[PDB]
């Protein structure tokens with residue numbers, strides 16, 4: 001290709017806000033989005049807190065008719081997608097609608113809806129399943145409903161790669177544009193796994209923090225007292241656009257997407273190898289894709305989930321890739337504040353990466369009181385750090401050892 | 413790119429067989445794979461038949477330890493993937509494992525496992541959820557478990573685009589190889605939605621045939637008495653390989669993958685527009701990708717699900733794209749025999765497309781007794797038709813109006 005890809009529009013729901021500016025304000029203030037869960041009774045569970053979207057009003061986006069048919073993960077993905085498209089200023093016409101597609105994924109999809117239809121099935125039999133159960137619960141219906149609501153006729157699909165989803169969604173959408181199969185893609189991810197099955201499922205694996213006494217301190221990536229991830233909900237969407245297309249309509253450009261890498265660990269179903277060899281291969285692939293040397297990276301938005309094995313692997317991988325420069329770049333985990341948004345994590349963190357470029361500021365890793373053995377990089381502990389950022393990398397790693405990296409650059 | 417992509421290995425579980433040769437034998441004989449469902453009691457449901465995989469032994473592939481942790485859709489996907497890799501003859505080493513990835517998707521994933529964990533949750537509370545619930549049920553764990561079992565460290569992901577899944581999986585894997593991010597990909601899809609939630613879910617939408625009296629006649633694409641699709645299970649995987657890579661190891665090449673197209677209808681959540689305008693755009697995209705004129709296509713493996721709206725739309729789209737040549741090509745739906753394998757449909761049908769090329773034979777559309785108004789193409793009614801096939805197209809269309817087309821060519 002010679003086709004450059006830029007970001008023209010962003011949208012988000014997160015535990016820190018109902019839109020990108022409100023969430024980013026929270027990020028730069030070191031605010032926690034984590035609180036006891038209000039929407040179900042978790043008094044019998046080992047983890048009773050997480051990152052909820054607070055005060056979401058679906059009727060800002062959808063009729064009550066439409067919304068009642070859709071699982072919350074679809075509601076969230078559509079909210080982020082609609083926010084991003086509005087933010088971009090793009091006008092969809094007959095001249096361009098075939099060139100505009102969508103790639104919004106989810107890691108687990110409509111778990112709450114499935115749980116509710118299961119209850120109906122078991123209590124009252126299969127005729128009590130909703131007729132809207134399938135199209136309201138399956139992962140590709142963020143892409144599907146968005147394309148229908150906006151008349152988008154370009155490439156229409158959905159990734160599901162666990163915690164990597166939102167990163168792969170964005171990366172593969174950028175490939176579509178570079179290849180010429182679209183001029184614009186709305187890409188990202190959404191998740192709402194905070195139901196009994198979800199919390200129970202992650203809890204049954206002993207994967208979650210159980211710091212119920214201080215939920216805001218629970219997510220502490222690279223801290224020696226970390227004890228598992230914090231489950232969070234929400235969504236992130238970006239409008240990706242071919243550069244000449246964006247220039248021709250006078251779009252506001254946030255940043256350029258210059259590289260995308262993937263790898264597989266081929267190691268274990270849930271733990272990475274302790275040296276993060278797969279993550280290293282992934283990061284190198286993304287830099288090679290971008291035509292960048294490691295020394296050109298200024299900011300890493302780490303995956304950094306607050307797990308024992310995961311966090312130290314990612315340090316090892318950054319040291320392996322970056323060598324001495326690993327001590328010059330700034331690296332932080334915004335999951336310290338947002339928790340782990342699962343399929344949406346990579347989408348929200350890409351947005352935070354783009355804003356780090358816009359605002360020339362590395363967001364903090366809050367709660368990093370006692371860095372663990374070998375966690376001796378600049379992890380932007382405690383407080384946001386204004387600094388020079390030309391290039392920002394964002395990593396996501398997922399169950400199965402599936403890895404993704406995005407590389408963004410200031411646009412000039 | 414200049415990088416050509418060829419098919420070196422194929423694997424399948426279907427209602428017609430436990431491997432590709434057994435299934436293909438069934439296809440060319442016009443055999444139905446549809447029967448009353450045996451593994452649950454459907455006497456209270458409106459549809460009590462479907463296409464099951466019969467006599468599957470997971471212990472040919474996995475230990476009983478491993479297998480008990482995985483939903484049947486994962487079991488099936490791994491079986492097809494292992495069959496394809498074995499079929500290819502490729503040997504994985506340290507020199508190539510970073511260049512070999514996987515893209516196996518699913519439309520709905522681990523529904524049976526979810527249903528079972530829901531029962532445990534409701535009866536006995538969240539501590540009775542399996543610790544293996546999440547990694548045994550999520551869609552990306554075919555990719556994940558395969559990469560771990562074979563040591564594959566290339567691009568590792570999963571599509572979920574409803575009935576389009578297996579087509580998009582193959583197409584996007586081919587893009588990986590063309591782009592240079594892999595030399596080999598194992599790609600396709602798997603599905604096992606035959607549980608109460610699944611049958612109940614599709615039934616609640618009145619989407620399924622209810623011809624319980626003659627299950628083998630239920631799937632009748634383009635027949636005027638068609639009354640909905642037939643739910644089927646199974647999987648299909650292909651080993652896609654860069655041409656020089658395949659040549660250098662003396663691989664047996666089945667066919668070349670020359671084009672991949674996508675589109676969105678942007679019309680309705682489950683029905684296509686009656687003129688199949690989206691499908692037409694998709695097919696044209698795939699031919700444009702392949703550098704082919706419509707007149708070069710000899711065989712279409714139609715999506716052809718046996719629904720009222722879907723089947724006639726696809727006829728309209730073929731007539732729009734192909735013009736007079738629409739009466740020269742042969743087009744058939746193998747779902748007449750296999751039923752609708754959902755996320756796997758496009759993967760099995762790609763395999764049937766490749767074999768149509770190998771064997772120079774268009775598989776039949778069985779049950780096409782009374783073609784509906786305007787269904788006046790060569791639909792290979794009743795009996796397989798030996799003929800010249802240089803180019804074979806395979807379509808898949810999905811909920812949300814998501815479309816995909818693959819174009820294969822005899823390799824010379």
Ligand SMILES: Cc1c(NC(=O)c2cccc(N)c2)c(=O)n(-c2ccccc2)n1C
Pocket residue numbers: 107108161162163164202207229270271272303305310311342343397398399400401402546550
């Ligand atoms: C903790 C976690 C995952 N894993 C990670 O973050 C993770 C972190 C470091 C290394 C690796 N290889 C993965 C994930 O993929 N999750 C998920 C599951 C189902 C659906 C959506 C996400 N979860 C919960």
Ligand SMILES: Cc1c(NC(=O)c2cccc(N)c2)c(=O)n(-c2ccccc2)n1C
Pocket residue numbers: 134138519520573574575576614619641682683684715717722723754755809810811812813814
């Ligand atoms: C009947 C059917 C679908 N649709 C189609 O085949 C279909 C056929 C013609 C046109 C269009 N646009 C779609 C599908 O996407 N399904 C699915 C749902 C959930 C998961 C997996 C597949 N089903 C059941």
